[PDB]
Amino acid sequence: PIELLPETPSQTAGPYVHIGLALEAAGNPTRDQEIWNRLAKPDAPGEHILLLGQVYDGNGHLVRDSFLEVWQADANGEYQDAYNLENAFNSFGRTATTFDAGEWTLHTVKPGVVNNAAGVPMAPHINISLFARGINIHLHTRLYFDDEAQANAKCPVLNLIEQPQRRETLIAKRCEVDGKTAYRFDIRIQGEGETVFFDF
Amino acid sequence: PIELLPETPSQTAGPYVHIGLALEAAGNPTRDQEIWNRLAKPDAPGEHILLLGQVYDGNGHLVRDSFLEVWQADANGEYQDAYNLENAFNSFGRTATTFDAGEWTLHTVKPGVVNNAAGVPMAPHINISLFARGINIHLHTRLYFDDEAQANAKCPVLNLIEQPQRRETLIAKRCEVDGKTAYRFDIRIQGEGETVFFDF
Amino acid sequence: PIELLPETPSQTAGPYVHIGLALEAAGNPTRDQEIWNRLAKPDAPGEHILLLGQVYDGNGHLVRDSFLEVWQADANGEYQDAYNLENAFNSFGRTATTFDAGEWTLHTVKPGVVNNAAGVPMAPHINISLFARGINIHLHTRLYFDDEAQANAKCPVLNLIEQPQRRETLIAKRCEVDGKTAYRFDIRIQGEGETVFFDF
Amino acid sequence: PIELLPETPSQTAGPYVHIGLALEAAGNPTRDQEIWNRLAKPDAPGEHILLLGQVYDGNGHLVRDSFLEVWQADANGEYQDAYNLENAFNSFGRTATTFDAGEWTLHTVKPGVVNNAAGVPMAPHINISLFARGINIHLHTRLYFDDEAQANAKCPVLNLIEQPQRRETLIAKRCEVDGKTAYRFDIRIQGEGETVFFDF
Amino acid sequence: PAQDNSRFVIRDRNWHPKALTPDYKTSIARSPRQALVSIPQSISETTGPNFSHLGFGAHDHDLLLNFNNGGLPIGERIIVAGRVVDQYGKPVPNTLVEMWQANAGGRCRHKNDRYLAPLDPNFGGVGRCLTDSDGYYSFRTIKPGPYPWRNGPNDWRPAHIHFGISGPSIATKLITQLYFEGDPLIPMCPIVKSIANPEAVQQLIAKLDMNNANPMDCLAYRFDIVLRGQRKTHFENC
Amino acid sequence: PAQDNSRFVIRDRNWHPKALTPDYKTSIARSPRQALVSIPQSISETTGPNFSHLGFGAHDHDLLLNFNNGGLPIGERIIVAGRVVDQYGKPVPNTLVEMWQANAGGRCRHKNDRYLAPLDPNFGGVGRCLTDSDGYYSFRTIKPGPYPWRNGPNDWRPAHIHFGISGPSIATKLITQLYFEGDPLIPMCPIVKSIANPEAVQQLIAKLDMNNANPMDCLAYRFDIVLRGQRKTHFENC
Amino acid sequence: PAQDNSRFVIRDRNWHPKALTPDYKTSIARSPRQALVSIPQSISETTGPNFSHLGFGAHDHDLLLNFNNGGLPIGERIIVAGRVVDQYGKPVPNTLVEMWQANAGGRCRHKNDRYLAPLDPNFGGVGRCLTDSDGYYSFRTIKPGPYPWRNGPNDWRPAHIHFGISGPSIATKLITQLYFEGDPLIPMCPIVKSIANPEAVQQLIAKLDMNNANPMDCLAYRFDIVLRGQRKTHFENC
Ligand SMILES: [Fe+3]
Ligand SMILES: [Fe+3]
Ligand SMILES: [Fe+3]
Ligand SMILES: [Fe+3]
């Protein structure tokens, strides 16, 4: 068969991932421009939301050293690839869980609907990539919302997960933190209530 | 040492096992003579029983594509190897769980007592072989009955299972389905209350 | 692929083929029972014929050392496999061309119609096998008759030969030798008017 | 020495060459634009000629499955590489001999004079490439005309053929087909009067 | 009735695929975590069904004609023949060989198969044959095409025909898969790779049989099946 | 008009198949007995047709849709893609690549083909594509099945797609055949064996391209074509 | 009468010697220039003569006694034995095996042989045998000597015994030559070199069989013959 050049193999991000990718979360001095958790500036269009959650290991213990990367469409269902800190909205963002804050936070807007390759509308989602010590190759997952139940039932990606009980792990529970619309999304890497992880 | 010809390796039965081994269950047109779940004809000797069960995977979810093959003795404790549909009783039979029916059914009689190689009487049992996608090599198990407590305590095969709590997983519970004597035998392939599987 | 045992390779019959297969044609003493050119005894059923012909090389010169074997059905279109010299008709026979007789002769009856594997009638034919010095592996050919033109035009074997002009080389010309029905069949191994040879 | 990448090996065009390269000749439905035997449209400059010929194999039999590709200059001796069906003249064309028509036809104009690499004028010719089953690698030849005797005697390509009798095989004879100027060019692939084939 | 007069060679579970083979995704939730309990062989294990009296239709082995709605299936006409022997090389007569496959495009005749390659109106994909006295079976079918499946993102099953062999006992009963010689998809499939030993993968590769092919008609493939060796009981209970 | 500015590398006629290859029967009566007359290259040989202006239909390269009478063809959906380069490794842009093949069963859509495998009412078997700026072509078709032919008594052609490549000149013009990776019929075919050098047979074997395959849809095969090297004229006539 | 129930494995004409082998001079004018026409197997090709009822003389297989004018032949007394099997290894019973050879000095009993080595008054050189139930044949003869022939100026044939085997059909009929183990003339002979494959030449070499030799009497040579494989018909005309 046709053998192409092999991809550089992955390695764990390590326990000190924060010093190179989450400088403020570490406690080290930052540079002029950093890629962090503020995807949407207060003046960005759409329904402004606060996303929070904790990452759990297989023993039900908190992962206080994780690093997460997010990718989502704007309120109009368009992906903004040109990252610039002067933009009202950026489709990309970074967050983490530390020993000082076992809960990650993300300030963004609710993503609009985007079509798959076949032209079928997918439910509002946020693409997540999880890195940490002990995680040799990153874990891909999606965050769906509980108030979009009609769209969640008709999503081609969510419907690819055989068991209905496992689809619920990708659904973030709506709450309120100081008058702001909030969704809680806990990631359980292993065991009871294990989060669905993707490959693509 | 002495090496014989190697046995042909097993492979999974696959998701579409039913088109070749359970035609009626696959919704495809049947041939004149099929091997199915009716082991005993209404005028067959012995206590006529209905056997039903569900197959669970390691997440406690139903296996709706399983294929089961049963081998049991008649009411007199004799194995009828000569398979013919004209016979009142056939020791062999095939059953399955489908997406339309997540429960398998078997119409047979309660088996009589058979001795092991050492002449010691084994409790009334039904030999079951389980095939499905994800199962690389079929799983062998035995179905024992709860109203045969005295015989189950003396069985040489059942006593080979070290822990008494694991012996319980092979014991079918007596119940009633539509005013007919029935036994429920659920199979848990993996996890909590995992069914004892054999090697011979 | 599946490799079977290989067939013993052929070698030329050699210049002295007659001493072992055509003892009388050589000039050496014969044994009690020989396989020769008298396929049909004068009392055999069907139209009694005399077959004669010369074998030519590529330079148009006579082959005075050839050996031929023939196989044909009787007048009823049946192949008589059980060779016995007491039979009225034998389906098998042997002939040759010597330095004393550059023309081979064959005394037999006209073969009846036989069907191919598909059930389609083949025209009356005699299967010939040619051996000689310089012929590393024997040449297979068929002898057809000119007075059976309607059958010759509908034969599946004769119609497999692409060119009509090459089909004429397999057709023996009718003549009369002393009041006996005779057919002349010259075989040209190479060159102008080359005889069609078969592989099966 | 210096070795370059090897050229992809040739293979025969096969018996069914027409389904892919001569759709109309294969009796199959055609596409909107096809490459065929009409090189010149009625209003094209030059002497309009009809070219016909038969292809013979080594036994003098007709090749009814040949495929021919022609390359010629226009009346002014210029090669028109830009193939378009809207053009009055196209230097390229394809023709074929079928089982229904054992003769190939080509409607074109008589080519003008073109010089070789050394500046010496070559006689009016048509470059022909012959493909068919049995021909592993296509045969290249040239079609010269009999009424251009003076130019044919001076041609540098025609004079490269050592023997003058072999030069005659490349000369098309002037004739008339239905009151129209025509030239007959028969190609003999093998044997007596074998057509001169080129290598370049 | 059936008797306890035979003993079967213990299965080499390191030759056979393991229960837990991660690359084959569905095996994760469908594999036992507890060890298999070894039990001696008895009449329950050493006996099995005999299908000599089952009513076989005339075209049960011929997949080119057993569905017939008005014509012939589109695909490479092939004969899949072979012998069923045991580990000692002894033939296994009057045994049930059941098979099922996809069409020339890799489409299976099941409601759950939503693969875009069309169904062949003249092809069922189901076949059954009882071995002869010498242990030989033969099927006439079309070469199944490979098909994609939801395992990895670009996982393709090699062209295969599923096989079900009964044998003299429920102990010998085996379900396996046949693969075709030279198919470049064989070393890439997670179901094939579930077998650790490369020499075991070779036993599943049906080889081109030109000798069994019908000239100007159909090709042939040879697939010999080896079942657990059967031996008589000796020195049991002194 | 076209000019004489190019010279083509002389064909290695020992790499290419010989005219007379006895095992391939039809070659006996259709091969020249006299030697080919070597002539220098001129404008007649160094130039050729350019098909950039030919009216290509939208589905001319897509054999799954270019015959369409109401559906999709039965067979293994594949992409046959590759690059057309010359001996120097230089891409050959805007060149005509024509192809033809049999259906999934080895049946060709011609009146002379009386092979018992049925015709597919949704398959033509004809395809054409003009290479892009980088010399790449692509066809979407079904994998052709092998077919028998009247050569030897049990001769079977390996699954193949016939190719016709124009190139920059009539000197580069080539008709060849593509074979599929791992097909056990390749070392047995007399048409393949007409090529003496085994390394040359390898250039005709299209390899499985999993990288170009469409997940859950179709597989892919890569077939790169190498045409005669084109070089500029130097030091001619001093 | 005989019935059309068997099919025979097609001859490998690349294993067998070709018609045109120029070093064997006589083959030049006696080899067909046109290709052999392939025809399918019918009752005319699949049947052949059965010689079980032919009257064999008591000494037909014994060349030491079948000429007898008052004595025993001069030469190395040898037993030539072996088995006639088919390509499947199946024994070929009741088949006709004929043989002929020269005397201990290379002189054949024919009028055209004017070689100066004398004739043996007690040796003819002809033999015939019918194989038993297990396909075995046996001959008793003297080891023939090499002989010169007008091919090249100094060409010598190795010591050989010509063989003629009928088989179950005219399709299996074969004429060959047996050569002897270690003879330095085997790789020098044009008739032996007519066979391209050196492994094919090995099947023609009779091996010294000390086990089948009679102590203080004669040596033995084993020569096994393999005829075309026979198989029953299957799936013909559907
Ligand atoms: Fe580190
Ligand atoms: Fe499958
Ligand atoms: Fe000799
Ligand atoms: Fe073809």
Curated annotation (Swiss-Prot), chains A, B, C, D:
Residues the record lists as binding 3,4-dihydroxybenzoate: R133
One Pfam family from the record: Dioxygenase_C
Keyword Iron: yes
A Gene Ontology BP annotation from the UniProt entry: beta-ketoadipate pathway
UniProt cross-references to InterPro entries, sorted A to Z: Intradiol_dOase_C, Intradiol_dOase_core, Intradiol_RC_Dioxygenase, Protocat_dOase_a
Source organism, top-level taxon: Bacteria
Keywords: Aromatic hydrocarbons catabolism, Dioxygenase, Iron, Oxidoreductase
Involved pathway(s): Aromatic compound metabolism; beta-ketoadipate pathway; 3-carboxy-cis,cis-muconate from 3,4-dihydroxybenzoate: step 1/1
Cofactor binding note of this UniProt entry: Binds Fe(3+) ion per subunit.
Single GO MF annotation: ferric iron binding
EC number annotated for this UniProt entry: 1.13.11.3
Catalytic activity: 3,4-dihydroxybenzoate + O2 = 3-carboxy-cis,cis-muconate + 2 H(+)
EC top class, as a word: oxidoreductase
CDD domains recorded: 3_4-PCD_alpha
Cofactor(s) the protein needs: Fe(3+)
Family according to the record: Belongs to the intradiol ring-cleavage dioxygenase family.
Quaternary state and interactors: The enzyme is an oligomer of 12 copies of the alpha and beta chains.
Physiological role: Plays an essential role in the utilization of numerous aromatic and hydroaromatic compounds via the beta-ketoadipate pathway.
Record-given protein name: Protocatechuate 3,4-dioxygenase alpha chain
Gene that this sequence comes from: pcaG
Curated annotation (Swiss-Prot), chains E, F, G:
Swiss-Prot/TrEMBL cofactor(s): Fe(3+)
Pfam families per record: Dioxygenase_C (PF00775), PCDO_beta_N (PF12391)
Record Gene3D superfamilies: Aromatic compound dioxygenase
UniProt xrefs under CDD domains: 3_4-PCD_beta
Source organism per UniProt: Pseudomonas putida
Protein task: Plays an essential role in the utilization of numerous aromatic and hydroaromatic compounds via the beta-ketoadipate pathway.
GO biological process: 3,4-dihydroxybenzoate catabolic process; beta-ketoadipate pathway
Alphabetic keyword roster: Aromatic hydrocarbons catabolism, Dioxygenase, Iron, Metal-binding, Oxidoreductase
Enzyme Commission number, as recorded: 1.13.11.3
Residues holding Fe cation: C108, Y147, H160, H162
Quaternary structure (record): The enzyme is an oligomer of 12 copies of the alpha and beta chains.
Protein name: Protocatechuate 3,4-dioxygenase beta chain
InterPro entries hit by this protein: Intradiol_dOase_C, Intradiol_dOase_core, Intradiol_RC_Dioxygenase, PCDO_beta_N, Protocat_dOase_b
Gene Ontology molecular function terms on file: ferric iron binding; protocatechuate 3,4-dioxygenase activity
Entry's family note: Belongs to the intradiol ring-cleavage dioxygenase family.
The reaction(s) this protein catalyses: 3,4-dihydroxybenzoate + O2 = 3-carboxy-cis,cis-muconate + 2 H(+)
Keyword presence, Repressor: no
Cofactor binding: number and manner: Binds Fe(3+) ion per subunit.
Pathway(s) where this gene product acts: Aromatic compound metabolism; beta-ketoadipate pathway; 3-carboxy-cis,cis-muconate from 3,4-dihydroxybenzoate: step 1/1
Class in the EC hierarchy, top level: oxidoreductase
